[PDB]
Subunit: 116 residues, 4 copies
């Protein structure tokens, strides 16, 4: 219930998610940045029996019917309930690269999600 809903990050990206009773996370992601357009499928897992924030993570491969950025982002964070529910994350964005360029394949950042 807590997790399920629409969330936006500081970049203006949109995350629509449903938390299943089995610890599954499914929804779609709409990105404000990068080489993207439209929504992308997301899938993740969360602690369906948390103690403290709720640990969760999700992935988006930046490929839909319109574009392919040949990359994937994984968000690792925790959900924090209250008046102002937030999802605090750290993410890794890996681009498919040649062996020579593999060293600079992964970006790291942090996103804060606000529930609408």
């Amino acid at each position: 219930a807590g997790i399920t809903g629409t969330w936006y990050n500081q970049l203006g990206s949109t995350f629509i998610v449903t938390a299943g009773a089995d610890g599954a996370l499914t929804g779609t992601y709409e990105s404000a940045v990068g080489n993207a357009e439209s929504r992308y499928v997301l899938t993740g897992r969360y602690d369906s029996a948390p103690a403290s924030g709720t640990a969760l993570g999700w992935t988006v491969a930046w490929k839909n019917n319109y574009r392919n950025a040949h990359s994937a982002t994984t968000w690792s964070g925790q959900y924090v309930g209250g008046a102002e529910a937030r999802i605090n994350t750290q993410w890794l964005l890996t681009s498919g690269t040649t062996e020579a360029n593999a060293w600079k394949s992964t970006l790291v950042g942090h996103d804060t999600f606000t529930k609408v």
Copy 2:
């Protein structure tokens, strides 16, 4: 096909994955370290129409029928096919923490998966 199979990291953890034609990653993860025992459900996404490496990612919430470590790991990387196929990753392990311990909620590492 290539991604689909049983993989092992340096630590001896086992990742059994099924790669869907649509870009879905589904499977089971069995760890060799941490507050864990047995297999855990994994879910991810991958680039199903790659260009050189194949971008992918997945999440495991460290909760099963036996234990709950109140944490989740996300692996972000690329599959490199060939005679000696590998999955080179970087991971974030976030524990559910109180707001006071939030600064030290996330661990970062790298794992190399092979079929051996």
Copy 3:
């Protein structure tokens, strides 16, 4: 000039730094969290001829005359001038560990520094 001064992060930690004409960073760090007390020596490097933020980084080994946490933090970020000068960073905190526990040796986070 820009970089040189007293800065505080969101945790209430204190960073006193002087930027040398040669791209050197020296000062002391006073931590609000962890197993620390008093100041610790810091050393870093910055782009003394920036274009865009100014790229910089610094390290602190958590050892002084009073305590030893057997760990080191490296902050990688950029300085951004203006009315409100800020240092936006990502950090890695590695703890000396045995080979068995090396996998969980490194924490990752992000700090924003405000100049006073």
Copy 4:
């Protein structure tokens, strides 16, 4: 003594370091990748009174007499002594960027240094 010497990462970059009794790391870094040429000054800190691995870190701003990549890398890790001494690190490479490209300013990787 142990840390002091010439080390090489997987990429073939060369790290010449001097470890001070007081916990200072000073030296030169010569890269094998990126918008770089020649040696760059490095500065860091290390635990000079370790317990098993030895925590350390260092920074290189990618500016010298020949080029300026307007970026800086920080390596955070541990020195493991013995017959086959190694320095296992994780690094953050931040480029100076405009505020619009700040989200993708930082790369993350891992380097293993040996004396061979």
